[PDB]
Amino acid sequence: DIPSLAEAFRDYFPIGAAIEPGYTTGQIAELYKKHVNMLVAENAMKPASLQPTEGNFQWADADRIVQFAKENGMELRFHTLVWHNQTPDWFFLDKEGKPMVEETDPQKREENRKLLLQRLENYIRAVVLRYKDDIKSWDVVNEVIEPNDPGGMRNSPWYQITGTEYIEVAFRATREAGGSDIKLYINDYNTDDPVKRDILYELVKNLLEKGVPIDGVGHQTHIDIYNPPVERIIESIKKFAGLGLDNIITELDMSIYSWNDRSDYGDSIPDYILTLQAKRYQELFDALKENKDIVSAVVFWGISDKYSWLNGFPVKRTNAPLLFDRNFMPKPAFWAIVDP
């Protein structure tokens, strides 16, 4: 009989995990029931899943995850209302079916700006009205920052057509349809990086000054056994806390390969690698525990190494980013944080 992961952090913060509808039954489901008290949909609540084509919403998968959470008293997070990825291309086509970004006529572009914002409003209202009562934490916009793009704003179709308007409207629309009780977040990765951190900080500060309802920042925290320094992760969290914003570790996982490594340990995986992973995780959680009053939740991007995007991205290989192995057994990293 091993200890429950979430129970170990009873006095600090809830522990969550991303999930797919198919993992709501069977042994994998029992693993979730024993170790986490919060859930987020890995893919079932992205735009591509909820409204594949205009006016044709698909709720089954998302509803299933909501029901599983409620049956087990788990809190829910919504991932994610706005994102340049996994969003059907129909969103950005003009009335003739051609990409809005290609329009050169000023008047048609103005028409397209209003049309896209109308689509955004209607999409958000439908989704929020359906889940506002069961989901209290929302990733309203995701990955809108890109240092390499002009001004540091990701130059996605959303931005090319509406500038920062889509972000302002997204938060406002979510607040109006959802009420004052739900918490709204802007989520992103590499939020520990000084440059990206400050760009995000300036944007949020400006938006807050304009009255945009933003409650906190989501730090995906997709890191690895080598980088980045735990100090940088905490520095970012404290900086945003200075604006009165909450912080959530939203998609925590730890690749066993560095950024420039394309090798594959295969079945194996050296002992020191799993031990190093444990040391990194222990160091991270020791720091997160010291910041519990500004970090409302810590969510892992999964629960078992059997199911992780890192096993296929950037390449197909054997990764081991989580706390439980492919047989759902506790890894060194699990013991390192529940009994360090």
Q: What secondary structure does DSSP assign to 78-104, as a single string?
A: EEEEEESSS--GGGGB-TTSSBGGG--
For residue 301, the SS3 value is coil
Using DSSP's 3-state secondary structure scheme, residue 195 falls into helix
- Candidate list 75, 103, 143, 168, residue with the active-site label: 143
Sign, CA torsion 309/310/313/319: negative
Cβ–Cβ < 8 Å for 30, 91: no
Of 139, 336, 325, 331, residue with least CA distance to 218? 139
Give Cα separations from 74 to 36, 134, 136, 216, 312 (angstroms). 8, 10, 11, 21, 29
Rounded-to-integer distance, Cα 316 and Cα 313, Å: 6
Contact predicate 51/86, CB 8 Å: no
Distance, in Å, from the CA atom of 79 to the CA atom of 43, rounded to the nearest integer, reads 8
Technique of determination: X-ray
Rg (CA), the chain: 20
In 3D space, the residue among 199, 197, 198, 138 whose CA is nearest the CA of residue 171 turns out to be 138
Domain total of the chain: 1
Give, rounded to a whole angstrom, the gap between the first and last alpha carbons of the chain: 18
Please enumerate in sequence order all residues whose Cβ is within 8 A of that of 312, keeping only pairs 6 or more positions apart, or say none. Answer: none
**Whole-angstrom distance, CA of residue 148 vs CA of residue 154:** 8
Strand 216-219 and strand 295-300: the pairing is unpaired
| 143 counts as catalytic | yes
Q: Which domain holds residue 64?
A: 1-340
**Tokens of residue 332, six digits:** 């060194």
Q: Residue 145's beta-bridge partner residues?
A: 153
Q: What is the CATH number of the domain that holds 86?
A: 3.20.20.80
Place of tokens 């914003």: 245
Asked if 42 is an active-site residue, the reply is no
Resolution of the PDB structure in angstroms? 1.8
Rounded distance between C-alpha atoms, residue 88 and residue 78, angstroms: 18
